[PDB]
Amino acid sequence: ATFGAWDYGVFATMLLVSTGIGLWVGLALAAVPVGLSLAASFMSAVQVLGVPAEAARYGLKFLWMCAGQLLNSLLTAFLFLPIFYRLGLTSTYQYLELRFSRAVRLCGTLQYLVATMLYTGIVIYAPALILNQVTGLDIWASLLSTGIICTLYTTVGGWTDVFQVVVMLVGFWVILARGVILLGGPRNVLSLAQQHSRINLMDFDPDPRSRYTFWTFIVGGTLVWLSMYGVNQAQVQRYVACHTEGKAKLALLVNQLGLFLIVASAACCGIVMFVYYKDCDPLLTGRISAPDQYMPLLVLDIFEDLPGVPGLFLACAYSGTLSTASTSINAMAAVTVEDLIKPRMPGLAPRKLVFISKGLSFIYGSACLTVAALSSLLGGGVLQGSFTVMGVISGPLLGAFTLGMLLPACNTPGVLSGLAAGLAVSLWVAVGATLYPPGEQTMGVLPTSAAGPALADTFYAISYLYYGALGTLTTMLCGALISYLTGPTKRSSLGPGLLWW
Ligand code: NA
């Protein structure tokens, strides 16, 4: 029910060792490692908690997420990697500089900082949620602990990604292997899932309100993962540092393979989790309050006769998530210093520049902890929360980049107005859904079992995967229209720039 004795020791020892190695790194590349770094940059305990739960509650439709990811990678390697290897170097928003203006560069950097801050807040909340659900500590003590450890990793801590990805994969495989053997027979699990309508691959429901479906997954995942891989500063930084566009596409391929493995393993583990709870769903029984508590519960249930392992898995999912959060915070600080402060403070006390970078890292860590606390209080849903954070905020940024590249007739006022309109629409739909969320029947939640305004109904029910796609598209539409209203930009006035070349 709540770890025990051996698994408490396992959790504590593993977390202490992880902190020690982090401090050692902070005090004391090839396509494959950098691609696995690309994969690890966005996979954390959020995906451990959410993907199995979403698969269990909807059923093997979540595999279509992989397809979305696939599209993302392809588009990147064919739309943004070539241009961010010849035109936009060093930074990603320098393209917005040399294309539209420095004002658009500042707008893009601010959007990236806000999106990353909120995403890292959700990321920090995920291990806090794991600790609260497992160890029993109230969510606020768990948030205090996770924030303290993340700030220790960032301020003090200053192949780790490969280790994280392999740990995620092995954990998922161990869970879904122990579950199948305990239940008895992979064929039996598949048959039980089929009976309870968990094998639902071919879902083409054109209704956007249906939370998960091929039509929703392809477009929404493509757009969100593009905003997270095609224009994200960290990912593009990892591209341009790969030393070759052709060898950067190899990194993207490795990243895509890692994402495929993680998502497939998580969905299969979620199906095993449901078939484990085929007759008595914990949600109906009240054993847990939110679906995000599904994964920590099963881990406790499966290995009740095998102490220690739950602590190992849920301490790996803690340390890896904290490493991801610290990398995000430090990247935010570095981006702020390099892209904003340095231009207006060119040669003032490089030691002061290091001091300012440290201060920004601390400020961003604190802000991310505050966002984690807000997410804890402000309802729940971590996988949807992260995709609505990276969707509404960064979606318009991807729209700005795509308008700057694809459309020759795009101008600084055009892209700025498009960004404003896209942010407005995306936040409008997000708040409408938060206040007036759709029901389980509308979204498409599969049946459970316990035997052991017109606008708010037609729009706010839109699948969360459509938030980002709603923003980006808006930025591409409005930004285009205003461009042709104020003044169409001339192809001659642009350098290589546009993908058309
Ligand atoms: Na996510």
From Swiss-Prot:
Sites where the protein binds Na(+) 2: 47, 119, 228, 386-387
GO cellular component: cytoplasm; nucleus; plasma membrane
Reaction equations catalysed: iodide(out) + 2 Na(+)(out) = iodide(in) + 2 Na(+)(in); chlorate(out) + 2 Na(+)(out) = chlorate(in) + 2 Na(+)(in); thiocyanate(out) + 2 Na(+)(out) = thiocyanate(in) + 2 Na(+)(in); nitrate(out) + 2 Na(+)(out) = nitrate(in) + 2 Na(+)(in)
Activity regulation info: Perchlorate inhibits iodide transport activity. Oxyanions inhibit iodide transport activity by blocking the binding sites for iodide and one of the sodium ions.
Extracellular-side segments: 56-59, 133-138, 179-213, 272-305, 379-381
UniProt topology in membrane: Multi-pass membrane protein
Residues in the Cytoplasmic compartment per record: 81-105, 237-248, 334-356, 408-411
Any one of the GO BP annotations: iodide transmembrane transport
Residues binding Na(+) 1: 44, 46-47, 119
Record's keyword annotation contains Secreted: no
UniProt cross-references to Gene3D superfamilies, sorted A to Z: Sodium/glucose cotransporter
Residues where Phosphoserine is found: 492
Intracellular or extracellular location(s): Cell membrane; Cytoplasm
GO MF annotations, alphabetized: iodide transmembrane transporter activity; monoatomic anion:sodium symporter activity; protein homodimerization activity; sodium:iodide symporter activity; symporter activity
Binding site residues for iodide: 51, 65, 225, 383, 387
Keywords: Cell membrane, Cytoplasm, Glycoprotein, Ion transport, Membrane, Metal-binding, Phosphoprotein, Sodium, Sodium transport, Symport, Transmembrane, Transmembrane helix, Transport
Effect of residue 44 to A/C/D/K/T: Impairs sodium and iodide transport activity
Entry's transmembrane regions: 6-22, 32-55, 60-80, 106-132, 139-156, 160-178, 214-236, 249-271, 306-333, 357-378, 382-407, 412-435, 462-486
Family the UniProt entry places it in: Belongs to the sodium:solute symporter (SSF) (TC 2.A.21) family.
Record's subunit section: Monomer.
Function text: Sodium:iodide symporter that mediates the transport of iodide into the thyroid gland. Can also mediate the transport of chlorate, thiocynate, nitrate and selenocynate.
Protein name: Sodium/iodide cotransporter
Name of the gene encoding the protein in the UniProt record: Slc5a5
